[PDB]
Swiss-Prot record, chains A, B:
Glycans are attached at N28. The lineage of its organism: Viruses, Riboviria, Orthornavirae, Pisuviricota, Pisoniviricetes. It comes from the Viruses. It comes from Severe acute respiratory syndrome coronavirus 2 (2019-nCoV). The chain holds residues 1107 to 1147 of 1273 of the full protein. The gene is S. This is Spike protein S2'. Subunit of the fusion protein that is processed upon entry into the host cell. Mediates fusion of the virion and cellular membranes by functioning as a class I viral fusion protein. Contains a viral fusion peptide that is unmasked after S2 cleavage. This cleavage can occur at the cell membrane by host TMPRSS2 or during endocytosis by host CSTL. In either case, this triggers an extensive and irreversible conformational change that leads to fusion of the viral envelope with the cellular cytoplasmic membrane, releasing viral genomic RNA into the host cell cytoplasm.
Length: 41, 41
């Protein structure tokens, strides 16, 4: 909040609560998964 | 800070900010890599 330091959205620094219906003003964007699934081939 | 309880350095309990140049007094040590790369068949 108090300093400008942008970061890439990741599934680790954001938690998940419920489905997409109930909230108001929610926007549609993809969320990057952690490095380990990307490392897996 | 308030009690002595040493722990093994791990990539999960430490976050990463930038490269090695800008800080002062930084020392050279190896950080335990996560379990996913270690657990490879
Ligand atoms: C915010 O205000 C604008 C006013 O133009 C409105 O169109 C928009 O629906 C408002 N946002 C939400 C989430 O309702
Ligand atoms: C701490 O002080 C000592 C004094 O001997 C000095 O040599 C050292 O460079 C200082 N630490 C840093 C990070 O500058």
């Amino acid at each position: 909040r108090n300093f400008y330091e942008p970061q890439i959205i990741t599934t680790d620094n954001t938690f998940v609560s419920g489905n997409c219906d109930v909230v108001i003003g929610i926007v549609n964007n993809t969320v990057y998964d952690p490095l380990q699934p990307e490392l897996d081939s």
